[PDB]
Design a protein around this ligand. Structure first.
Ligand SMILES: Nc1ncnc2[nH]cnc12
Lengths: 16, 329
């Protein structure tokens, strides 16, 4: 997986 | 103080509530990081939470501390210590995959930090690769207190649904009340990412968030078999979906349990807390401030603040922000 860690990609965005 | 006291150098990040800047105290030419929050996002007492946690941070090495605190009509400002090593999100993109020895080191230091917050009634609630920063010497610092919950006593619980979906604990997704247990889960996910070079949930790194929540609750996670039995065992212990039985989460022995785990048996915890263990990796400081260690999608941005809209500015209670200014002695 080349795009394993994508800053602020799918699922990596903070939420409340 | 005031915005005019500082020189605004570069943008270096987008926090959970903030835009993070590199600044220099002009009167001293000292360099700091600066979190800038739009009051339109805060006005529960968030400011109270934030300052409460910054207060704890002075007394622990693995928590970023506060230099000072001021406000304009539209924004809050927190001047914090600058950590020029970059964060673990960047480290992982560059390293691809970390050896068990590296992952043990970072998780040990992270455990110390989480445990320090917990013993003082605080749930961190946003543990993630982006929020772990490297010291120039190679030690780690937890930043970003935006989602913290403080004042939590024993048997106290909260129910607020928040965090980063990739790291959100199963008990939150089920809508249970929860305590410290969710940080340990998050640590679980984070250790998995360091050692396997990807999220334990395939869709992350490859579509709605709701599906992600389902995957989290439903799929049994699969540990790469190349990993040692120690490493594997710690990951499944942290990634137990029942917080009652999850590593670190017993009310009396939780931290001891971690420290007693075979994966960490190789750790001298107190030499660790004192920063006397040598980091397995030493960030390369460019000399250009070490700005090389920050994603360019930030550093290639005008440092300009976006002018405020007088419709919103006048329509926000400046009173929830009285006596906010502060300087750490
Ligand atoms: N104190 C800090 N230093 C460097 N980068 C950061 N990103 C968020 N906080 C930071």
């Amino acid at each position: 997986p080349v795009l394993a860690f994508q800053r602020e990609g799918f699922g990596r965005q903070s939420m409340s | 103080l005031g915005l005019q006291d500082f020189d605004l150098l570069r943008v270096i990040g987008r926090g959970s509530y903030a835009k993070v800047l590199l600044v220099r105290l002009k009167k001293t030419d000292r360099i700091y990081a600066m979190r800038v929050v739009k009051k339109e996002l805060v006005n529960i007492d968030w400011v109270q939470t934030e300052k409460h946690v910054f207060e704890q941070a002075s007394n622990h090495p693995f928590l970023v501390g506060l230099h000072s605190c001021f406000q304009t009509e539209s924004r809050l400002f927190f001047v914090i210590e600058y950590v020029n090593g970059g964060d673990l999100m960047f480290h992982m993109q560059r390293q691809r995959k970390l050896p068990e020895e590296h992952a043990r080191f970072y998780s040990a230091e992270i455990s110390l930090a989480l445990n320090y917050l917990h013993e003082r009634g605080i749930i961190y609630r946003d543990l993630k690769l982006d929020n772990v920063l490297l010291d120039s010497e190679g030690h780690i610092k937890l930043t970003d207190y935006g989602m913290c919950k403080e004042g939590l006593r024993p048997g106290d619980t909260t129910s607020t649904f928040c965090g980063t979906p990739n790291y959100i604990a199963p008990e939150i997704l089920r809508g249970e009340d929860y305590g410290f247990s969710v940080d340990w889960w998050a640590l679980g996910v984070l250790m998995f990412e360091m050692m396997a070079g990807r999220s334990p949930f395939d869709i992350v790194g490859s579509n709605t968030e709701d599906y992600l929540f389902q995957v989290i609750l439903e799929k049994q996670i699969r540990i790469p078999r190349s990993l040692s039995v120690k490493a594997a065992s710690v990951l499944k212990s942290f990634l137990n979906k029942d917080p009652k039985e999850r590593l670190g989460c017993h009310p009396q022995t939780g931290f001891a349990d971690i420290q007693g785990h075979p994966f960490f048996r190789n750790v001298d915890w107190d030499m660790m807390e004192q920063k006397q263990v040598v980091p397995p990796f030493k960030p390369n400081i460019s000399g250009e401030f070490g700005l090389d260690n920050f994603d360019s999608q930030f550093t290639n941005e005008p440092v300009q603040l976006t002018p405020d809209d007088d419709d919103i500015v006048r329509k926000i209670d400046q009173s929830e922000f009285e006596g906010f200014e502060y300087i750490n002695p």
